[PDB]
Amino acid sequence: TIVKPAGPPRVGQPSWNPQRASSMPVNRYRPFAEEVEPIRLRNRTWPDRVIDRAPLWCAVDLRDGNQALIDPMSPARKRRMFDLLVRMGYKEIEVGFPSASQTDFDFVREIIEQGAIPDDVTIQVLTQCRPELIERTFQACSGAPRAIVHFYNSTSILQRRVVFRANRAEVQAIATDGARKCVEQAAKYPGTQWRFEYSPESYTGTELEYAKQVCDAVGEVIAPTPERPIIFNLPATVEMTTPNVYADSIEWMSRNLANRESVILSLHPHNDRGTAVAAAELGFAAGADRIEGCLFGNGERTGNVCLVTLGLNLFSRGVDPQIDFSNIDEIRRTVEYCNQLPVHERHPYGGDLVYTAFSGSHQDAINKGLDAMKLDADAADCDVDDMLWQVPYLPIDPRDVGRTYEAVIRVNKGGVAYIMKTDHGLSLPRRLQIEFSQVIQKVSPKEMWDAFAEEYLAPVRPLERIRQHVDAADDDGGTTSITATVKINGVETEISGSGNGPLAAFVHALADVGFDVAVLDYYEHAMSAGDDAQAAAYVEASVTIATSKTVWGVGIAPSITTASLRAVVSAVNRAAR
Amino acid sequence: TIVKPAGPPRVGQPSWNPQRASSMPVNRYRPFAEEVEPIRLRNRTWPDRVIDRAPLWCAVDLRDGNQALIDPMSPARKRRMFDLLVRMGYKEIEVGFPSASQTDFDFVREIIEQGAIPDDVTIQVLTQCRPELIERTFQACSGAPRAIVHFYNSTSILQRRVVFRANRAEVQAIATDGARKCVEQAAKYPGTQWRFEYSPESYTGTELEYAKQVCDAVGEVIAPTPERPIIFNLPATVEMTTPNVYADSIEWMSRNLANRESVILSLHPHNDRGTAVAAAELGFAAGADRIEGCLFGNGERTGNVCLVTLGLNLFSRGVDPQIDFSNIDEIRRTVEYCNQLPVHERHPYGGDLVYTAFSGSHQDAINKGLDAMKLDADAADCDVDDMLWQVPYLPIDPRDVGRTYEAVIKGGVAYIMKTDHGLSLPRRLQIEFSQVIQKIEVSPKEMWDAFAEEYLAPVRPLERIRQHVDAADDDGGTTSITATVKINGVETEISGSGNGPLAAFVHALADVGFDVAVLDYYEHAMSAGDDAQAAAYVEASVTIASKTVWGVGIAPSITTASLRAVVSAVNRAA
Ligand SMILES: CC(C)C[C@H](N)C(=O)O
Ligand SMILES: CC(C)C[C@H](N)C(=O)O
Ligand SMILES: [Zn+2]
């Protein structure tokens, strides 16, 4: 159980701080400077640098993220993850560890053999330095027009001591021999353009002078040039300290590595201390050229730096990430499919709750910011969606990620969706729950229902539907025509249209009378069991009356066909409120 | 949908970077220096400062957290959260906004009347500046032996302009009148040790000179002393930029505020950019005294800074957080219960996977590390458990937080059908179909042929050729149907009536020995547009002259889609 800290306060601890020494065994842990080495960089320049271009991005989802899963990816999930990364615009993709995993081997064969790799994409494969594992890495890759062989070995103070029980020259030689084997294998395969990446694995627990020594030594072997450079990848395999010390280390490495013009400086931060995004951002500022990571932070334990957070962290401060995130829910769905692990509710940019507001004053402020943007657009004759986003509490326009701002209204166990289904038998499409909470925002169960009926069910002006005649074609693929008796602002009129179904027909019938309903989406469900249940239909439409608003329509009827036509009328009249 | 970036690379972009420009509207966003202002700070020292003591913690779970919740806390859940925070060792605890929330108001009354505050615990209540909201706040604390009164008003360039439509002097007066009110109310409420906190709300979006001037001014009103300090709380209401810049801002504020010995400088990071922890850590190194956050990062949108992450980031680097995390499961289980939101699997220290190693290589290193630790403990006659933790891949001993090192040794139907096929299968159809498929890995193409084979292709025992639907013109009228069908190859006319086309069709089926007891029904568009196709889903118990089935029907017509989903169900049944 948890017991209240009860030791004396520190010596010199101020009077206004009543905290107590805990009995946590801090003696078992040391400051990073004593665990590893003091990193002094008093002339650092990274704190004075604001990032202004995308890094070279490398997605490791298919290796590092895969390694990390309760259920590793099936051949299908591998392939889906691969096509998402390509389609988002990543150019370096680490596709597996084929010398260590027959399923990685099969996967790399597949993508080579079936032409899944675009000509601007370089596949990357991980290997350890054992020469036969390196041989089989090249074999995996046979037929690739180009590939990065990523080789590595652990170089930490603690691993050299207790894992390898090895000296500095011995641990360096693992890597130089690895490098040598890479050079000889590349020459045995002139059909692939080969590139190299070397990681001093557990870099963050390694002396920087030794990290430099091993990398320089590896570079001497590979012999890279400005046109044919090497990636030195510097991982925080364990994130051991604050991101500034990581940054200081990258700046030192950037200035001190031999042959710096023939180096792509790559970062690979983990998240043990919760600051993996900060390490990537600070370390990029420090002179790195490239960042390895995963969509939504997937990877071993606390994960790899999140490539979504890093990309939109650029977008939202005016830098093009060079990666498409304009449908973040498609990315999220694909990612959760592949990894079979949910993105958290509060995950930056992509979590369920991140475009929500629960505070009444946040809501009021957001509405004023939105209004003031809309006034400025009319003045400038511009589309508000093209202008400087200026809205309190929302770092970005959610529309720019295919998401919607949502004010969440508490209903006096609860919530709109929930009381609507339970007490009224309506399962409201999510974007209908959004739009209607916006209405309540301008509450008890009864108040919400009354408001709901006011917006969606009761209105009869400008459009009312009295009756209609549906002529459905008997033959599949045939035309449906409709004549309907409608009142337009109380005036009885006769409307007619045709379409591939009854909703299409009724939509074309209304166009002739000055209501343009451009239908975006449609849902329907029974309100009970039995062939004679009521049908509730929901229609999303961008509607124009003789400017255009997106609104929802709701209709309820004994007939599935009719419930759908009611929804349309509902929609039309909602657009006029 | 996601469209591959195709725009020209930037001028000067290296040859080794084949990345293309995205079509994201980056011109709607400006660098921070231009949205707000460039960095004021000359000679920063936070970069060379390594944290060696714990800050003063304040838990804002009961207000800032609670306000964030889909299901807000019951009185029981609050009490449970209050008690957890106390027991962990928190001395400052935000308990409500009682002036704006009656349930907040009750809670405060309750713990004051119940005598539930330990003598070392200060409660904190939030108010806005309006004089009536201040008085209601002091009334809620009526009788408290000590309390923090946190008043705030928004100061950002953006909110002055579009929220308050107010100039700098106006907004400062909102603040200093609040403080005046607080002073007056403090004087009308005897014997309680009233303590103040002022936040220039939306601080990261405010000019530094201006935030300092507002703060100085409020401090001149409170007239705090080193014995009775004021709290100035400087929130990243939105986390707007990198943590180094926040920290530059805090160092500047620390060096420049008036009456610095009477000031407890407080940080309130949010996580919009995923860097709230780093903002807190760099910021505390920059000279702050105090940090407000939530257990496991709860709070609006992306959340407040994680209190757990921060204290355990001190612990694992040899610094006492002065808070007990010896049993993080208990913390996590209580937090999830109070919040009714889960700690993510990857959450530092707390999450399901953070002491798990799936790699054989890692698992080997781990044992090599633990064996070397044992060797050493045996040498010195020591408990391993009291020795320097030296284990690759594991920053802490999972036993140090109540946890254990774990060496670990769907077909995706919903996702695939919807992505590849435009179908949102009902949940029970999802279950039913993925049963069919666990028996049949199956490729997405394979899963398609299997589905079409079950639900789409069968024309026996039932095939619908065509039908005439005589729909009721008038709401509530009968709909009739006549259909030409084939029953195991045999052309038959069926006909029937009911309250809609699906009832008409099910009535007709019944004459021909096909009893369809409809249990549920769904329909949706497969695309945007009034001419989209409909997918319809019908669940029935079917008696073919009582099997529970789904049918799926697809058609350009809403009506006809529904009829096909009937036929599909009948054939499923057989
Ligand atoms: C899918 C639905 C929007 C409409 C369908 N095309 C019909 O008219 O019935
Ligand atoms: C809601 C559905 C189960 C059926 C509706 N009574 C119709 O016949 O169209
Ligand atoms: Zn890694």
Side-chain angles (χ1 to χ4, degrees), chain A residues 1-2 4-39 41 43-52 54-66 68-77 79-187 189-227 229-299 301-373 376-398 400-411 414-429 431-441 443-460 462-486 488-491 494-546 548 550-577, chain B residues 1-9 11-14 16-39 41-48 50-79 81-129 131-164 166-187 189-208 210-219 221-226 229-332 334-373 375-380 382-398 400-408 411-417 419-426 428-434 436-437 441-442 444 446-452 454-543 545 548-574:
Chain A
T1 200
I2 290 288
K4 209 193 304 198
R10 306 176 285 102
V11 169
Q13 176 169 320
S15 32
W16 39 257
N17 179 357
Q19 299 173 177
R20 298 289 257 160
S22 78
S23 67
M24 295 211 72
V26 295
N27 46 287
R28 310 179 80 188
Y29 306 96
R30 312 184 276 187
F32 170 86
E34 284 157 54
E35 180 76 21
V36 190
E37 62 181 353
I39 307 170
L41 199 69
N43 48 17
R44 55 186 54 96
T45 61
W46 69 261
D48 298 308
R49 189 192 127 63
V50 178
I51 295 150
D52 61 358
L56 170 59
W57 295 114
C58 177
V60 306
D61 296 67
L62 287 162
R63 201 284 300 178
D64 216 337
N66 198 46
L69 292 188
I70 303 150
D71 309 308
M73 289 186 223
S74 68
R77 297 179 162 97
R79 179 52 187 269
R80 187 75 68 172
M81 178 51 81
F82 189 77
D83 302 328
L84 176 78
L85 299 167
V86 158
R87 183 161 91 261
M88 288 171 73
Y90 297 99
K91 293 312 165 204
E92 307 200 340
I93 298 155
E94 186 165 75
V95 295
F97 200 164
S99 70
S101 203
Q102 183 71 37
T103 54
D104 283 8
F105 196 104
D106 298 344
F107 184 66
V108 185
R109 292 325 298 162
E110 281 265 314
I111 70 184
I112 292 156
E113 298 178 337
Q114 302 161 15
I117 307 146
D119 68 358
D120 64 349
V121 163
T122 300
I123 67 153
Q124 165 170 321
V125 281
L126 185 66
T127 186
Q128 307 174 336
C129 289
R130 328 195 314 95
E132 79 275 359
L133 293 184
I134 292 176
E135 263 172 15
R136 160 153 273 246
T137 290
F138 282 71
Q139 291 174 33
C141 289
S142 195
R146 99 223 111 232
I148 295 145
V149 177
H150 181 200
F151 61 99
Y152 78 99
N153 73 300
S154 197
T155 54
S156 62
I157 289 151
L158 164 79
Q159 285 207 40
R160 294 206 305 273
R161 177 178 91 252
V162 320
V163 181
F164 305 104
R165 291 192 313 169
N167 76 14
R168 288 162 58 111
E170 269 141 38
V171 167
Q172 179 167 316
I174 296 180
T176 55
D177 291 359
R180 274 175 287 252
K181 186 70 172 162
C182 282
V183 173
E184 145 211 306
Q185 288 292 303
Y189 296 97
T192 303
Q193 287 288 289
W194 306 95
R195 305 189 35 222
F196 307 97
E197 180 173 321
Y198 171 74
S199 286
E201 190 265 20
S202 291
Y203 162 81
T204 59
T206 305
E207 308 93 329
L208 297 192
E209 50 84 19
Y210 184 67
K212 179 204 144 53
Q213 184 189 297
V214 191
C215 295
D216 291 351
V218 166
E220 278 297 322
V221 170
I222 277 89
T225 70
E227 304 81 27
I230 187 174
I231 307 147
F232 284 128
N233 187 55
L234 298 187
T237 309
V238 175
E239 179 175 46
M240 279 188 82
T241 189
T242 54
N244 64 293
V245 170
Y246 188 68
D248 278 343
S249 90
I250 302 308
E251 183 158 9
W252 187 96
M253 288 285 289
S254 189
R255 298 165 190 195
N256 279 283
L257 286 166
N259 196 15
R260 181 62 177 94
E261 63 291 342
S262 310
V263 178
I264 299 157
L265 202 49
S266 181
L267 312 185
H268 192 113
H270 289 274
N271 201 43
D272 303 84
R273 287 182 53 93
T275 54
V277 167
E281 274 165 4
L282 297 199
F284 185 42
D289 315 298
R290 167 193 206 268
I291 307 178
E292 298 189 356
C294 285
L295 302 175
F296 290 107
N298 185 49
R301 293 171 274 285
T302 67
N304 282 271
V305 71
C306 175
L307 294 168
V308 186
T309 312
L310 285 169
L312 292 166
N313 275 4
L314 298 170
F315 168 76
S316 66
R317 285 276 67 95
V319 183
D320 186 14
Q322 302 183 310
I323 305 299
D324 194 50
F325 299 100
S326 79
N327 191 338
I328 204 190
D329 281 359
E330 183 188 334
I331 309 157
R332 182 185 53 66
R333 270 187 251 107
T334 309
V335 173
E336 293 180 333
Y337 167 62
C338 298
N339 302 331
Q340 287 178 280
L341 280 173
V343 174
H344 200 241
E345 282 88 352
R346 313 219 175 284
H347 195 109
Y349 300 107
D352 290 337
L353 299 168
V354 318
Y355 300 107
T356 66
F358 289 72
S359 153
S361 54
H362 298 188
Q363 292 162 355
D364 170 55
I366 287 161
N367 298 339
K368 277 148 201 290
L370 293 174
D371 289 349
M373 288 192 59
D376 289 7
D378 298 341
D381 310 304
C382 289
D383 188 350
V384 69
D385 292 345
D386 299 332
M387 297 185 79
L388 188 68
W389 178 263
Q390 287 303 262
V391 176
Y393 309 97
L394 297 163
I396 69 172
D397 184 346
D400 285 347
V401 293
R403 296 281 297 267
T404 308
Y405 158 63
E406 162 188 10
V408 184
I409 298 298
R410 263 84 149 253
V411 194
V416 182
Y418 180 93
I419 301 140
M420 291 306 309
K421 188 66 166 186
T422 329
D423 308 340
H424 305 287
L426 310 178
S427 288
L428 302 189
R431 303 193 296 291
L432 194 157
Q433 324 161 358
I434 305 166
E435 172 179 288
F436 171 67
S437 295
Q438 214 58 68
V439 172
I440 296 154
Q441 199 275 315
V443 100
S444 75
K446 156 140 187 86
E447 283 161 7
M448 162 214 76
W449 166 253
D450 297 339
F452 184 86
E454 259 192 285
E455 293 300 324
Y456 295 117
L457 306 179
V460 107
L463 168 69
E464 178 174 24
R465 174 212 57 81
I466 310 297
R467 77 182 59 92
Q468 72 292 308
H469 193 63
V470 190
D471 184 21
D474 283 22
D475 281 283
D476 297 348
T479 291
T480 300
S481 282
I482 191 168
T483 301
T485 316
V486 297
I488 309 166
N489 288 314
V491 187
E494 269 256 303
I495 60 158
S496 256
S498 285
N500 66 11
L503 195 149
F506 187 60
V507 164
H508 309 158
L510 298 163
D512 275 341
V513 297
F515 304 119
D516 184 62
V517 180
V519 166
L520 295 183
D521 210 351
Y522 148 86
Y523 300 83
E524 198 167 5
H525 64 90
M527 309 198 262
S528 88
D531 69 17
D532 68 337
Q534 301 294 301
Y538 311 90
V539 162
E540 199 190 28
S542 158
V543 175
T544 304
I545 304 163
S548 86
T550 303
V551 303
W552 285 85
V554 187
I556 294 153
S559 172
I560 280 155
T561 303
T562 322
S564 104
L565 312 173
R566 286 174 163 285
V568 173
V569 167
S570 187
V572 164
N573 294 336
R574 260 287 308 163
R577 302 202 110 223
Chain B
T1 201
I2 275 136
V3 183
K4 193 154 103 172
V11 284
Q13 187 164 315
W16 46 254
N17 187 353
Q19 277 165 203
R20 304 314 289 214
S22 75
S23 64
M24 299 206 72
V26 312
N27 55 14
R28 299 182 83 192
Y29 307 91
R30 308 176 273 210
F32 180 82
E34 140 177 0
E35 184 67 24
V36 183
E37 72 182 353
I39 298 195
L41 183 76
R42 317 278 101 97
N43 278 33
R44 57 182 57 95
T45 63
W46 65 263
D48 311 294
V50 173
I51 290 159
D52 61 14
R53 44 185 170 97
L56 176 59
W57 305 109
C58 171
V60 297
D61 310 63
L62 290 171
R63 196 285 302 174
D64 219 323
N66 188 47
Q67 167 95 284
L69 313 171
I70 315 171
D71 313 285
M73 291 183 210
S74 58
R77 285 160 51 221
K78 303 182 162 216
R79 215 149 64 230
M81 180 55 94
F82 187 78
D83 299 343
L84 169 63
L85 296 168
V86 171
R87 260 164 57 231
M88 282 180 77
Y90 298 98
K91 294 319 163 186
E92 286 186 10
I93 302 173
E94 200 170 65
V95 294
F97 196 160
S99 86
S101 180
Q102 178 59 47
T103 61
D104 276 15
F105 189 104
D106 295 331
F107 182 68
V108 174
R109 293 314 324 150
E110 156 160 340
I111 52 159
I112 295 174
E113 291 164 13
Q114 220 194 250
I117 312 153
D119 303 342
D120 53 1
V121 164
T122 300
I123 61 164
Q124 167 172 319
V125 297
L126 190 70
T127 189
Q128 283 198 284
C129 280
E132 76 280 356
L133 294 188
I134 307 198
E135 42 183 344
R136 190 141 176 88
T137 305
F138 277 76
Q139 287 160 13
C141 305
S142 230
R146 69 202 85 62
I148 311 163
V149 183
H150 177 188
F151 58 102
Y152 77 84
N153 67 307
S154 310
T155 58
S156 61
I157 307 166
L158 180 54
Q159 287 216 32
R160 307 200 307 269
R161 192 179 74 256
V162 317
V163 186
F164 295 83
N167 67 43
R168 279 198 197 179
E170 298 171 333
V171 173
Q172 189 174 304
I174 295 148
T176 57
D177 305 331
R180 262 167 315 265
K181 190 59 186 219
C182 278
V183 181
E184 157 205 280
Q185 296 294 294
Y189 284 99
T192 296
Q193 301 303 299
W194 295 106
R195 283 266 314 272
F196 306 100
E197 173 173 331
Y198 169 70
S199 299
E201 200 264 22
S202 293
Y203 159 82
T204 43
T206 306
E207 313 90 321
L208 288 191
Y210 182 49
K212 187 224 82 217
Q213 293 167 5
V214 181
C215 290
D216 285 348
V218 154
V221 180
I222 310 294
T225 64
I230 191 148
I231 299 155
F232 292 131
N233 178 69
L234 301 179
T237 304
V238 185
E239 195 185 29
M240 287 187 84
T241 192
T242 54
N244 55 304
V245 185
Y246 185 65
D248 281 340
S249 87
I250 299 297
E251 189 165 355
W252 189 95
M253 296 285 287
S254 201
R255 286 181 192 181
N256 283 291
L257 284 149
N259 199 19
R260 181 72 181 88
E261 1 84 78
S262 305
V263 162
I264 291 166
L265 197 53
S266 169
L267 304 188
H268 188 113
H270 292 76
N271 201 46
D272 309 270
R273 297 183 52 84
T275 58
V277 170
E281 281 170 357
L282 295 195
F284 184 42
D289 299 299
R290 183 171 181 280
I291 306 172
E292 308 187 333
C294 295
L295 292 174
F296 301 106
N298 184 45
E300 281 245 25
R301 295 164 272 279
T302 67
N304 295 276
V305 74
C306 184
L307 286 185
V308 166
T309 300
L310 288 169
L312 283 174
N313 281 351
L314 296 170
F315 171 75
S316 56
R317 293 273 63 95
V319 170
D320 186 357
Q322 291 191 323
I323 301 284
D324 186 59
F325 300 98
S326 262
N327 195 359
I328 196 181
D329 271 353
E330 192 52 57
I331 297 163
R332 175 199 173 169
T334 311
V335 163
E336 290 183 337
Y337 167 67
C338 290
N339 283 348
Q340 289 171 262
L341 298 164
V343 177
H344 195 239
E345 288 91 319
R346 303 223 184 281
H347 200 103
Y349 305 105
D352 291 328
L353 301 166
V354 311
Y355 309 113
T356 282
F358 286 109
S359 160
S361 273
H362 298 191
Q363 277 158 12
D364 185 60
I366 293 169
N367 293 315
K368 282 188 175 64
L370 299 163
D371 290 345
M373 284 180 63
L375 268 219
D376 276 24
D378 296 349
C382 272
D383 195 354
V384 222
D385 298 353
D386 304 320
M387 305 265 322
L388 200 71
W389 180 253
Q390 292 288 259
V391 184
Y393 302 105
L394 292 180
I396 57 151
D397 179 354
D400 284 352
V401 299
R403 287 282 299 274
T404 79
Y405 172 53
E406 298 293 29
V408 172
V413 145
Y415 172 83
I416 296 177
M417 300 298 306
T419 305
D420 281 4
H421 299 290
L423 299 175
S424 312
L425 309 185
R428 306 185 286 288
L429 172 50
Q430 251 158 68
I431 278 54
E432 158 183 300
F433 190 46
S434 27
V436 164
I437 260 168
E441 170 190 66
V442 186
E446 299 189 36
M447 169 183 319
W448 186 234
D449 311 318
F451 184 83
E454 295 293 301
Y455 303 96
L456 302 188
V459 297
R460 284 168 90 103
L462 182 66
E463 173 173 17
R464 181 199 53 87
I465 313 303
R466 62 182 80 79
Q467 70 288 316
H468 193 59
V469 183
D470 180 25
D473 277 38
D474 287 303
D475 305 342
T478 304
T479 294
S480 315
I481 206 172
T482 308
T484 302
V485 301
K486 291 187 170 19
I487 296 144
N488 284 296
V490 182
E491 190 183 298
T492 317
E493 299 290 302
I494 59 162
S495 170
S497 276
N499 64 356
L502 201 54
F505 196 53
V506 155
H507 284 263
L509 288 174
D511 305 328
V512 79
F514 289 125
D515 267 81
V516 182
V518 175
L519 302 166
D520 217 342
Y521 144 87
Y522 300 90
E523 194 156 6
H524 69 81
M526 298 173 58
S527 242
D530 57 77
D531 70 345
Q533 296 229 284
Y537 311 81
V538 173
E539 192 190 39
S541 45
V542 173
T543 312
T548 307
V549 283
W550 287 91
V552 176
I554 292 161
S557 166
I558 273 168
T559 311
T560 311
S562 77
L563 307 185
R564 296 179 158 260
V566 185
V567 166
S568 182
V570 169
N571 294 327
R572 257 336 269 357

